[PDB]
Amino acid sequence: KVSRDKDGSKVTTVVATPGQGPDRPQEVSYTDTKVIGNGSFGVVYQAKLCDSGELVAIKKVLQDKRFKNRELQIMRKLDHCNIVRLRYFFYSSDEVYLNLVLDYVPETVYRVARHYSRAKQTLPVIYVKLYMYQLFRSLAYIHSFGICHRDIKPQNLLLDPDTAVLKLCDFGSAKQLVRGEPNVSYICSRYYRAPELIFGATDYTSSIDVWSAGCVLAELLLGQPIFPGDSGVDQLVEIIKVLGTPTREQIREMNPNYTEFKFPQIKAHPWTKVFRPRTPPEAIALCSRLLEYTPTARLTPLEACAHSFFDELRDPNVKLPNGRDTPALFNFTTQELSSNPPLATILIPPH
Amino acid sequence: KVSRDKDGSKVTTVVATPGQGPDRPQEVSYTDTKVIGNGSFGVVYQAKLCDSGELVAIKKVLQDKRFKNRELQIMRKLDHCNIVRLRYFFYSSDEVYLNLVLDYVPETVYRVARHYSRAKQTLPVIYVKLYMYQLFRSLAYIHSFGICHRDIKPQNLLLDPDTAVLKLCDFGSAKQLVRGEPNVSYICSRYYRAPELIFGATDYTSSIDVWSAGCVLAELLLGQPIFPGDSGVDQLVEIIKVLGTPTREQIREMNPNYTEFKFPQIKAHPWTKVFRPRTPPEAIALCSRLLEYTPTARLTPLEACAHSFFDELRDPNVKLPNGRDTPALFNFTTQELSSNPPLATILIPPH
Ligand SMILES: c1cncc(-c2nc3ccc4ncc(N5CCOCC5)nc4c3o2)c1
Ligand SMILES: c1cncc(-c2nc3ccc4ncc(N5CCOCC5)nc4c3o2)c1
Quick one: A161 and A292 in the same domain? Predict the structure, then answer.
């Protein structure tokens, strides 16, 4: 149903299923439709809900009538203050397309980081603290269902610039991981791709997203990607220029069934000398505990939230630089704490 | 057949059909196997042919037993001094893999350009002339069969640093184009992606590779990508920051059936001011005649080879910077000249 309104604006009307709650299709009307993105998956639009005037993203993907949609199924399970809400899905135009209708979120971490790096400055550490902590929160939520995003990268970290709320988005590579069932290795964006994936591992874990997260923290301290690989294997070169060649024991922990890369024995660069001189040590320390070769040695997301780097966040006297209070950082559910319930003592200050 | 040799080296032995010549499967033995690349498709290896000691690349793709391999079919038709030779294909390990055996070529244009940009210098224009001319030669060859590479980019331009010979590679996106059969629009690497592709055009031509080639020339003069889009649609933004908004007549030439991008009316930046001050004008001029919105207005590859920018190449007294003579630049076939045979007078100096 394409019509015009009281003011002659082009209104689209569609029959859409709520994203969460009962499978009960209501009619939905939106206008001001424009393309804000595209990829292999399809197009992303901005539109405005008529009824409420709220802004949304609509991700339009092609749907194999016969195949069921992985991304849809995950989006429908998820409800978290740091994950973008699926409000509705619907279908449209002899091929069938799936449309996901999500909260619009005005900025991303990529676009913010660039503003700074183009002006040769680093994001103040309080912005880095707020963003990383919230990302780890989102990761802990989803990893507690065995869901692994597999494309953690700054362009997929939305933020509201006034509240500093972070919403994880683009579950187009997400997948519930299953011990024993193999996974594609060419996944995740080059720079944020965990080393085991570059080695062809098909039996990895949700700890690949922690690496991805480390690459981002690093990026926000550095002002540029830490591992700027030109190609899939050059990435490994770049990881090695910092971490040095891994032990054989590490290379096993990543992928037991691997192949010959045969690179020169380079020695590990000192961590502190990677970053600029005033870089908070707490930050560099956390960085080190994320960017480990041995996937099982990387912190957990809940573990990462608990790191001393995020102590300033747990200060009662903390405010956003614009004077407003911090978004809800402490209101953990049971599902969120499942991975390690006793960490609640640190993550939840009295106040 | 995995064995050991006279010197105890791990020798792999396989049954492989020559790429060119009669369909006659011979035994082939190679050693010194290592991974030099990977992508969605699979892995790329270096190995050494035992018999001759020659180096090769082996691109391993997964083969749907039922689907036939586009890339294989094209590779087998192609034979050109500026395209990487398929020496052999074979199959290996419940899944079947196709292995393509190609001449090893030590360097690429991407890696050479970067060495320079990292040292804040631009490639001498004679290297830009040699590389661009040879690319256009390769493009003219393949376009004379209606084959369109569809992923022209500097990482896919291999070169021997001593001879300055360029071989085009990665035909993983190539396709014999067919009037009235649609083509996927999300193709080609972002920066080198022709505008009509970003507009969703499924009815494009081998003229998209000329665009891509213009983006490379530009890159080599600039020291960095001319159109550094962060996303699929942002690319269009970046193209527009230079060329300015296209007329409605152009937007039709690219895609008659398009959709709402709704961007600001920006004014064309002067061409000369895009590049640095000493940039030879012939270069900027050629660049302008490649990077046109209207696909039919872009030069042809044979046209491009003819352009005055390449006059220095056609000077009898011309040498490589290393003192040695220039590679074979003039030995055009009939197939190469088919698109416009009379250009032969300029392309083929008396000497
Ligand atoms: C690619 C693949 N799959 C999903 C996504 C995606 N989901 C959303 C949700 C909400 C969004 N809200 C805003 C937005 N703007 C604004 C920030 O810069 C451009 C993207 N983009 C959004 C978006 O993009 C992207
Ligand atoms: C990806 C998709 N389709 C094809 C390929 C591929 N074909 C060749 C041929 C020959 C090659 N020779 C060398 C080489 N090195 C070393 C120097 O350049 C970078 C990779 N890479 C080669 C290559 O890669 C890769």
Answer: yes
The answer to the question of residue B3 being in a domain is no
Q: Which residues contact A180 (CB under 8 A, 6 or more apart)?
A: A203
Cβ pair A5, A31 in contact under 8 A: yes
CA–centroid distance for B65 within its chain: 29
Phi, psi of B111 (to 5 degrees): -65, -35
- The reply to whether B70 and B127 lie within a common domain is no
A315 carries an active-site annotation: no
Q: Note which residues in 69-98 of chain A have CB less than 8 A from chain B.
A: none
A262 touches chain B (CB under 8 A): yes
In chain B, the N- to C-terminal Cα span, in Å, equals 51
Write down the experimental method used for this entry.
X-ray
Q: Does B6 map to a domain?
A: no
Phi, psi angle pair for B10, to nearest 5°: -70, 105
Q: How far is the CA of B159 from the centre of ligand 1 (A)?
A: 40
User: What is the distance between the alpha carbons of residues A67 and A73, in angstroms, rounded to a whole number?
Assistant: 12
Instruction: Round to whole Å and give the CA distance between B104 and B85.
Output: 9
Q: Among residues A176, A173, A177, which one has the least CA distance to residue A156?
A: A173
Give me the sign of the Cα torsion angle B154, B159, B162, B164: negative
Structure tokens at B132: 């661009």
Element containing residue A253 per DSSP (H, E) = helix A248-254
Task: Give me the helix-helix angle, B125-143 and B208-222, nearest 10°.
Answer: 170
Ligand 2 atom closest to Cα of residue B84: 9
Answer with the one of A71, A104, A137 that is the final residue of a domain: A104
d(CA B206, CA B229): 22
Instruction: Answer whether residue A23 is part of any domain.
Output: no
Is any ligand 1 atom within 6 A of the Cβ of residue A35?
A: no
DSSP bridge pairs for B42: B39, B61
CB contact under 8 A, A233 and B35: yes
Measured CA to CA, the distance from residue A180 to residue A173 in angstroms comes to: 19
Partner-chain contact B36 A233, CB within 8 Å:
yes
Q: In b/e form, how buried is each residue of A300-318, taking b as 16+ CB within 10 angstroms? A: bbbbbbbbebbebbbeeee
Name the 3-class secondary structure at A104: coil
Closest Cα of chain A to B209: distance in Å? 20
Element spanning B55, H or E = strand B55-62
Domain-located, residue B327: yes
B9 CB within 8 Å of a chain A CB? no
Q: Any CB–CB contact under 8 A between B34 and chain A?
A: yes
Candidates A231, A234, A258, partner chain B, best to mutate (most B CBs within 10 A): A231
Q: How far is B141 from chain A (nearest CA, A)?
A: 28
The CATH number of whichever domain residue B65 belongs to comes to: 3.30.200.20
The answer to whether residues B67 and B144 belong to one domain is: no
CATH number of the domain that A288 lies in?
1.10.510.10
Q: Which domain holds residue B37?
A: 31-103
Do B264 and B287 fall within a single domain?
yes
Ligand 2 site, residue B108, Cβ cutoff 6 A: yes
Beta-bridge partner residues of B91: B98
Binding residue ranges of B for ATP: 36-44, 59
Q: Are residues A59 and A148 in the same domain?
A: no
Does residue B36 line the site of ligand 2, with CB under 6 A?
yes
Domain final position from A104, A122, A141: A104
